[model samples]
Structure formats: structure tokens, C-alpha cells
Target: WTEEEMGTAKKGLLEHGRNWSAIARMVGSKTVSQCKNFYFNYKKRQNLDEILQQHKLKMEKERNARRKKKK
Candidate 1:
């Protein structure tokens, strides 16, 4: 997945309190492990606390981005 996609998934997890499996499903991931792995690696690239502090609507935009990807 792209960093953008992973960032979106991370936003969902951090903002909405969603589980890895749920995020995996939303982002068309094959498995929860894949989601977890992606998130784990992604966490290293940015500030999780800062991202979590972002506005909710901003995170919604990321989720929407994910939806648009599947279409």
C-alpha cells in the first residue's frame, strides 16, 4: 500500500478506535496481520501523537480517500 493509504488507515485506527481487522477490511487489506504490519512500519515514519491530534474531519477525508481508491 502507498504511504497515503497507510496514513489513512492509521488515521482511522487512531481517531475512531477501530481494530486492525476492521481497518484492513475498509482499506481492502488481505488480513489483519497485514494491516498491523503496515501500521507498525508506518508508525516509524511519522508522529502518531500529532496525527491523532488532527481534526476528525481531516481524518474523514483520509477515509474517503480510501473509499475512492477501491472504485
Candidate 2:
């Protein structure tokens, strides 16, 4: 989605709450279900803190691997 579309959808969420139809209307192109899925995906992205934690742990593991480097 374009930045503008997401902005309208996000803003609509703030104003409309769970009114996906109204949010979709604000989006001006997507349907109601599209709005629902969009917000769902957006909230999923909001889980980035967990994702960052996992990646940080994996990076630490890689650091240990390099520390143990040998012939």
C-alpha cells in the first residue's frame, strides 16, 4: 500500500475503532475486508520487538561461532 493509503487507514482506525467499513471508505479504494487484513498485518508488524529479540539472539550465536573459529 502507498504511504498515503496506510496513513488514512491508520488514522481512520484511531477515529473509527473497529469500523473497518468506514476505514475502507477513508482508504478510498480497498474493500472492508481489505481494511481488516491491512490493520491485522499492521498490528503483526507491531510485534517487531519480539522479532528484534530473536535476531539479536541469533547474532549473538553467530558471534560465538566466530569466536570459536579454528582450522
Candidate 3:
């Protein structure tokens, strides 16, 4: 993604939370999965280190939940 697209996606994410459909529409090219992957991959590059750490913890918890659900 270009800087502009990344910026737009990031803005949409911050404003809309995990609404990838809305975020992709705002981005105007990337699809929902693309937006989600991009967001998770690039979010750490943003200056908010503490927020990123928290997000990481949340994601790990969610992953564990899903893993436990499989059993």
C-alpha cells in the first residue's frame, strides 16, 4: 500500500475499530482481508508502542481462546 492508502486505512481503523469492510471502503482498493492483514502487520510501525503492546496481548488472548475452542 502507498503511504496515502496506509494512512487512510489506519485512520479508518482508529475511527472504526475492527470494521474491515468500512476500513477497506475508506481505503478504496484493499479488500477486507487485505485491510485486516495490513492493519495487524503495520500497526506496530505506528508510534504508539504501549498501545501496540496491549493489542498484541489482546490478540494472543483471542488466539488462545480460539485454540481452546477447537477442543
**lDDT top scorer:** 1
Question: Model 3: which residue pairs collide?
Answer: none
Candidate 2 residue pairs that clash: none
Candidate 1 per-residue lDDT, tens place, 1-71, comes to: 68897667766767555477877776755787877777666665456655555655677788888897563
What tens digits encode model 3's per-residue C-alpha lDDT throughout 1-71?
Answer: 79786666556655655677887777756577877776577777545454445666777798988887553
- Per-model lDDT: 0.67, 0.66, 0.66
- Which residue pairs in model 1 clash with each other? none
lDDT computed for candidate 2: 0.66
**For model 2, how does the per-residue alpha-carbon lDDT over 4-24 read when each residue is reduced to its tens digit?**
865565566555555778877
RMSD of each: 10.4, 12.6, 8.2
- Candidate 1, position 52, lDDT: 58
CA-RMSD of model 1: 10.4
The TM-score values for the models, in the order shown, are: 0.46, 0.47, 0.46
- Candidate 2 residue spans exceeding 4 A from truth: 28-30, 45-71
Which 10-residue window in model 2 sums to the lowest lDDT?
44-53
Model 3 ranges off by over 4 Å: 28-30, 43-71
